[PDB]
Amino acid sequence: SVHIGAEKGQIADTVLLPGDPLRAKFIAETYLENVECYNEVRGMYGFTGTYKGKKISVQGTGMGVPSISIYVNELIQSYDVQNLIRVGSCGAIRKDVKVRDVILAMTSSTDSQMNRVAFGSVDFAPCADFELLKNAYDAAKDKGVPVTVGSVFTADQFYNDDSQIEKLAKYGVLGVEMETTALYTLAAKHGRKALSILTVSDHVLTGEETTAEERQTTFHDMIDVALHSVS
Amino acid sequence: SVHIGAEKGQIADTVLLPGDPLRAKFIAETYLENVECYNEVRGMYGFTGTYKGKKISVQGTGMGVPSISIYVNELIQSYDVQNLIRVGSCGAIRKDVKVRDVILAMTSSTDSQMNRVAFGSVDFAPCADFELLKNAYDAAKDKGVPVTVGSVFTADQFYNDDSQIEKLAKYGVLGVEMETTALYTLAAKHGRKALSILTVSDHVLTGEETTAEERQTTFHDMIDVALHSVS
Amino acid sequence: SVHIGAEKGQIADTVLLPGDPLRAKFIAETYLENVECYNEVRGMYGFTGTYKGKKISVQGTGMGVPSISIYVNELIQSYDVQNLIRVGSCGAIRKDVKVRDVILAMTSSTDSQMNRVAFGSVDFAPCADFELLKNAYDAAKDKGVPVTVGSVFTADQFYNDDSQIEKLAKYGVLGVEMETTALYTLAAKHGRKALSILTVSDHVLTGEETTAEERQTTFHDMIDVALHSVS
Amino acid sequence: SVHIGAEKGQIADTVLLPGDPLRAKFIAETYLENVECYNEVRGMYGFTGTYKGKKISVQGTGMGVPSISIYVNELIQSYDVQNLIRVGSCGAIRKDVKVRDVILAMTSSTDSQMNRVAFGSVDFAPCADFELLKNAYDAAKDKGVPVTVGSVFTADQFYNDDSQIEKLAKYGVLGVEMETTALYTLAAKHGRKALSILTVSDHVLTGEETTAEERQTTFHDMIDVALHSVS
Amino acid sequence: SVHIGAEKGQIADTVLLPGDPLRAKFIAETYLENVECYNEVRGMYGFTGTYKGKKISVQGTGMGVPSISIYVNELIQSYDVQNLIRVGSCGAIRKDVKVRDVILAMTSSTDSQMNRVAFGSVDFAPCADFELLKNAYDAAKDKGVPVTVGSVFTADQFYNDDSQIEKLAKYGVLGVEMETTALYTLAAKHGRKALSILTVSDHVLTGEETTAEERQTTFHDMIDVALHSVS
Amino acid sequence: SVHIGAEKGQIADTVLLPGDPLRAKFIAETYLENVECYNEVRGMYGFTGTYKGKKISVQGTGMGVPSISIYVNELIQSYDVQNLIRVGSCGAIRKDVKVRDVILAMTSSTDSQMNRVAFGSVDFAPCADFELLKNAYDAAKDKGVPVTVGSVFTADQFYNDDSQIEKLAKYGVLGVEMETTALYTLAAKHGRKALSILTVSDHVLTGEETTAEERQTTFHDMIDVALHSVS
Ligand SMILES: [Cl-]
Ligand SMILES: [Cl-]
Ligand SMILES: [Cl-]
Ligand SMILES: [Cl-]
Ligand SMILES: [Cl-]
Ligand SMILES: [Cl-]
């Protein structure tokens, strides 16, 4: 791994994938036991520890398809990671979706060219691993966390003058985020299992917005679901 | 409704959508009480009857995105249909898919341009309704029906000189059929609930063909599951 | 043929191709002698008989590029069909085009991706067989049927929120239909002769509209031209 | 008219359009009476004279879609030209096309983006005016001129590392030239009448070259036919 | 060279490339000594002479990517040309750009498909040869000619109903011309050095416009810069 | 500024943009006086200090078009930043590029869709500010720093199964990196000045790796040049 300063063996078979390396640090220190930091390259922290006896890693991915693609490719190809669960944030694009709602993404649309590069005329629809998604859905029931299950939009441009969020929302899309298409596509291509669990961090229609700090350290429900679903 | 010769009231709020109008006839006569044929236009038969007291319709769609789009648009827009369940077949493209398997499609890839026409540079990923999908999954598990949940590819060209099925299968796509992208996209755009349940007609990769018992068992299990997907 | 239940030999070298299998039945029973039905698979009727001593088949194609592609590929590749004449309907998109006008299509534009799948950056313009088109034009003069010769648009979406019919009409396009691009492309690729003869069934600008029954059984002029042109 | 230095009135309502302005000069001096040169801008000569009493213009267009688009737009929009007939050459791409053949183009494929710029996801198929084409065909047959009616490919790159001519020829395309898509599209958009008559300059596939008699005979027959295409 | 009637050796290693063959003639006769005309094919004049002891050719290219591509390919591949300097005109699309300003193009955007034909999903950005551009910039200082250095847009459609010049100007693009993308791409692909020096001939926003004659014979500053930069 | 936790005033009008926030820290502490950290959000550190009296900021951008787009948009739109200089690495793709070379990017190609989202059929070529580029070039030459001026490729996929680097290198592209298209496009759209200065991290083609002295010397020379690019 050009971008991960770890030795083979230091990363668990199951990895949680926030975009924010400081959230990775918060998750690891708040939820895991006997935490070791295996990566500090580019400040993109990665940690390994235990949750109720099961080994779990937590790896920052950065923002956007290209950043997450680097980390996910390295985790799969160099570290033999099997289960990859993004624990991210998203902007709500529908009135019925509220700030702090937890979303389980079945699939994601995108304006990244990554799949057109591979398929040309084909629209490739990425797909969550159903087993992971079902386990998350059951974990949410166990933990009393309401979840919304549906699709999201993986944006390349956070500030997009040509945004089609209005049409995407009319087509049922719940929220905008920046990573899921890459995670789902790369995991499937390599026969690994992926899922994106998202917390709504802001509402694109109303302007309601959580702070940087809130995003870093207060989205506890999605971590509860993620960790309970794998253990 | 240009293509459906029904009076208002004659179509139920839940419709099963086989591609073959003769299969529509067979489903209606085999599974429903007090069957009426509400459409003979173009020989694309549609029927309504009751299943355990509940009105259910069965409408042939024909083959391909443009044909199903006609029928689904008219069902949704002219008949206020709420739940739309495709019951059809696909050609399996992955070695791990057996011809005795029943597939619940979470999403579908396509070479249809219908979504590029709408979205341009955006790859739209159509999404099944999770409520219908989860009800189907539970119903399948309750009747010991081997079920796989994943994605399919909606082809425009049954005979395609430029087929990318090898790459699609590598990316995890289970099978090829000709309708799901349209059903899922149109239902979502109109806020209706859709699901595609697919039996395997043949194995495109291995060349394996079905037996009589497989055809009978998978078809019956598909209809059984479909009739337990709503509510 | 997966979709045609006929034995080699049962289909003539010359085939008329309505979209509606019930129109195929009407044509066969109304214009042909010693009619045999060689296909009932999916209710997509195909018939063979004689017109003034010449063997003629009439095969329903269904609606849309994918449906017609299935039938045309099978007719060419499995049944060695040589001359393929679509006898279809279209919606007028120009003021000067009237309901019940007969159109001979020189070529067709499309929003199907079928040719971009094959050619990428190339815009492939399908082309009628000039010999068939000339024979039709001369037949129309013989039978006293006015014809309009020009181009049509092969639509994937009968109900299209993103329709460019206004711009297409400004560019001279006469009408919208759902099959011609596929017929013309597939026939040329296989060295066979194709022509689309269309009757205007409705006017997209005025809203004038023939009934389902009228479409099924009253477009006699186009059949007269078609049959006279091959005999 | 930025690129044509003519006074109103100096250009006829019918114009022949060779690519080479020296061929324009040759056509005008060889076939027309009382010739005047109305344009010398950029050395792209245009001439007007009479053929059997009727005013006819001959305007060099240069090579490629952008160059002919300039001249055709100005002829149509500034000079109210009604009938526009390209008289040029193509490279034959099909074995069955001989270098002694004259081609009347029904339509043209292209790798130009001009129509995607206008239409996006739509493949626009440019269409010759059928009246001009049929007049040309009849004129050709009356003078025993071997004529083929079909489609051509309008190339942007005479030297193309990514040429698809093998596939184009398989799809029935007769030859390659550099102007017809633009002429046909622009004439139709403005409700004017166009046709392209093409001689074969060489055989791209077989490498066959023309002889003196072929060059003379095909050129003369092309001009003769062109001068009998209107009315 | 199919389009250049010269023998190897008759064209210099350094070639100036106006679009107008009459400007080529003006440049050659006005600035060069011992001028020979080596090409008259299609009236697209090409000349060779000396400027202060250095051999220089001046070759008309015609208008548009396809025309210039023909000439540039032949000059490189058949005549071993090393340095290619376009001396053209452009339309200003920004308020701060004035008529008769001389522009040195670093790069060019385009709506030609030529690079998508080669690269598909990749946006290829053509690039001036920095050595030639620096030499021109220093020559302009020596000769007292103000220059503007930036990017231009290579248009296929001089008359474009779908023009994006407003958005291009907002992105910093200086002017619209018809050749640079082809020159820069072809020179780089073949390891040769290219530069486009442009004079603003008209202002697209204000309507100010130089005459055909002014374009042909009065853009002396760009020739001064071009010639001084290579000698 | 969602992603930058700075007060108005804390960011300078000139910002250096390394991808790695730890390199941002290193640059600021090594080269600037009176350094303050103005951002810790997501661990994407940004610092401001003085260089020879002038306020200069150094902001980590992360990897890829979407990540840098976030930071650049916020710097430009919320902090009124005027000069933006990327200081980073690329993988060399041409045999004639040595790992000891420093590259000033005139433009960049990409497989990002960001500009097709904006422009559709237009290929937008991003362009460095020539004033900054020429200042950098002169500064490089004054310190005897081997500099190459040319284009780079902005990749979305560091690990790309469908890489076109062989063809890009043939077209003259020097190296591959992950940010420049976004920096150049966004700066130009907002009328700000940008440049990318790139060291070579490794040779993608030859496999050559850097030595300690090369890494140190190229990094120091890059920062030195950057700090002499404005004014
Ligand atoms: Cl967006
Ligand atoms: Cl396929
Ligand atoms: Cl439409
Ligand atoms: Cl070509
Ligand atoms: Cl334009
Ligand atoms: Cl790449």
mmCIF file of C-alpha atoms in Angstrom, chain F residues 121-217:
data_model
loop_
_atom_site.group_PDB
_atom_site.id
_atom_site.type_symbol
_atom_site.label_atom_id
_atom_site.label_comp_id
_atom_site.label_asym_id
_atom_site.label_seq_id
_atom_site.Cartn_x
_atom_site.Cartn_y
_atom_site.Cartn_z
ATOM 1 C CA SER F 121 -20.409 17.842 -25.728
ATOM 2 C CA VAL F 122 -17.629 20.398 -25.136
ATOM 3 C CA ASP F 123 -14.121 19.207 -24.121
ATOM 4 C CA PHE F 124 -12.993 21.940 -21.712
ATOM 5 C CA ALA F 125 -9.226 22.463 -21.541
ATOM 6 C CA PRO F 126 -8.225 23.951 -18.162
ATOM 7 C CA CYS F 127 -5.457 26.526 -18.403
ATOM 8 C CA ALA F 128 -2.828 27.707 -15.925
ATOM 9 C CA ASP F 129 -2.535 31.449 -15.341
ATOM 10 C CA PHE F 130 0.264 32.515 -17.685
ATOM 11 C CA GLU F 131 1.544 35.234 -15.372
ATOM 12 C CA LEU F 132 2.088 32.723 -12.517
ATOM 13 C CA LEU F 133 3.477 30.137 -14.915
ATOM 14 C CA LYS F 134 5.981 32.539 -16.497
ATOM 15 C CA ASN F 135 7.064 33.853 -13.043
ATOM 16 C CA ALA F 136 7.597 30.248 -11.951
ATOM 17 C CA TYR F 137 9.534 29.392 -15.056
ATOM 18 C CA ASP F 138 11.819 32.407 -14.622
ATOM 19 C CA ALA F 139 12.295 31.639 -10.915
ATOM 20 C CA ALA F 140 13.164 28.017 -11.788
ATOM 21 C CA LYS F 141 15.678 29.077 -14.429
ATOM 22 C CA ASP F 142 17.223 31.608 -12.001
ATOM 23 C CA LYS F 143 17.902 28.856 -9.449
ATOM 24 C CA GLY F 144 19.069 26.296 -12.037
ATOM 25 C CA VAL F 145 16.098 24.047 -11.391
ATOM 26 C CA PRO F 146 15.483 21.537 -14.241
ATOM 27 C CA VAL F 147 11.931 22.409 -15.310
ATOM 28 C CA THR F 148 9.624 20.930 -17.967
ATOM 29 C CA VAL F 149 6.521 22.830 -19.083
ATOM 30 C CA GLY F 150 3.689 20.731 -20.529
ATOM 31 C CA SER F 151 0.511 18.943 -19.652
ATOM 32 C CA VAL F 152 -0.458 16.386 -17.023
ATOM 33 C CA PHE F 153 -3.355 13.959 -16.633
ATOM 34 C CA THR F 154 -5.734 14.306 -13.724
ATOM 35 C CA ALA F 155 -6.844 10.787 -12.836
ATOM 36 C CA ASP F 156 -9.909 9.732 -10.863
ATOM 37 C CA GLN F 157 -8.533 6.197 -10.463
ATOM 38 C CA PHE F 158 -5.030 5.776 -9.035
ATOM 39 C CA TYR F 159 -5.682 2.047 -9.604
ATOM 40 C CA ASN F 160 -7.242 1.921 -13.064
ATOM 41 C CA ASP F 161 -8.002 -1.263 -14.944
ATOM 42 C CA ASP F 162 -8.766 0.866 -18.026
ATOM 43 C CA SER F 163 -5.812 3.237 -17.910
ATOM 44 C CA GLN F 164 -4.957 5.086 -21.130
ATOM 45 C CA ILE F 165 -1.563 6.303 -19.968
ATOM 46 C CA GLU F 166 0.290 4.694 -22.909
ATOM 47 C CA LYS F 167 -1.797 6.713 -25.387
ATOM 48 C CA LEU F 168 -1.656 9.819 -23.194
ATOM 49 C CA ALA F 169 2.145 9.658 -23.131
ATOM 50 C CA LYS F 170 2.202 9.213 -26.931
ATOM 51 C CA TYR F 171 0.098 12.427 -27.096
ATOM 52 C CA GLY F 172 2.808 14.200 -25.067
ATOM 53 C CA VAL F 173 1.283 14.119 -21.557
ATOM 54 C CA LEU F 174 4.137 14.179 -18.956
ATOM 55 C CA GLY F 175 2.682 12.568 -15.870
ATOM 56 C CA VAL F 176 -0.368 11.534 -13.857
ATOM 57 C CA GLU F 177 -1.705 13.241 -10.730
ATOM 58 C CA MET F 178 -5.098 13.751 -9.168
ATOM 59 C CA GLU F 179 -5.975 17.412 -8.754
ATOM 60 C CA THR F 180 -4.911 19.884 -11.444
ATOM 61 C CA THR F 181 -8.037 19.806 -13.683
ATOM 62 C CA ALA F 182 -10.125 20.881 -10.664
ATOM 63 C CA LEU F 183 -7.752 23.613 -9.489
ATOM 64 C CA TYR F 184 -7.395 25.130 -12.942
ATOM 65 C CA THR F 185 -11.069 24.914 -13.876
ATOM 66 C CA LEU F 186 -12.332 26.326 -10.546
ATOM 67 C CA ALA F 187 -9.770 29.148 -10.408
ATOM 68 C CA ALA F 188 -10.626 30.214 -13.979
ATOM 69 C CA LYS F 189 -14.401 30.024 -13.446
ATOM 70 C CA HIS F 190 -13.956 32.441 -10.500
ATOM 71 C CA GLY F 191 -11.368 34.707 -12.136
ATOM 72 C CA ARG F 192 -8.542 33.688 -9.778
ATOM 73 C CA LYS F 193 -4.974 32.747 -10.687
ATOM 74 C CA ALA F 194 -3.738 29.138 -10.497
ATOM 75 C CA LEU F 195 -0.671 27.045 -11.190
ATOM 76 C CA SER F 196 0.410 23.459 -10.457
ATOM 77 C CA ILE F 197 4.051 22.699 -9.799
ATOM 78 C CA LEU F 198 4.730 18.982 -9.632
ATOM 79 C CA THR F 199 7.625 16.838 -8.588
ATOM 80 C CA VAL F 200 7.945 13.289 -9.865
ATOM 81 C CA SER F 201 7.188 10.696 -7.141
ATOM 82 C CA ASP F 202 8.094 7.759 -9.352
ATOM 83 C CA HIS F 203 8.280 6.701 -12.959
ATOM 84 C CA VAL F 204 5.160 4.799 -13.913
ATOM 85 C CA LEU F 205 6.639 3.627 -17.228
ATOM 86 C CA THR F 206 10.278 2.804 -16.325
ATOM 87 C CA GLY F 207 9.599 1.925 -12.658
ATOM 88 C CA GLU F 208 12.410 4.216 -11.566
ATOM 89 C CA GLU F 209 12.180 5.367 -7.973
ATOM 90 C CA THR F 210 13.533 8.496 -6.356
ATOM 91 C CA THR F 211 16.539 8.743 -4.062
ATOM 92 C CA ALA F 212 16.712 10.781 -0.829
ATOM 93 C CA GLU F 213 18.632 13.629 -2.505
ATOM 94 C CA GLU F 214 16.110 13.769 -5.393
ATOM 95 C CA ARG F 215 13.125 13.918 -2.979
ATOM 96 C CA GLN F 216 14.754 16.615 -0.864
ATOM 97 C CA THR F 217 16.082 18.676 -3.790
#
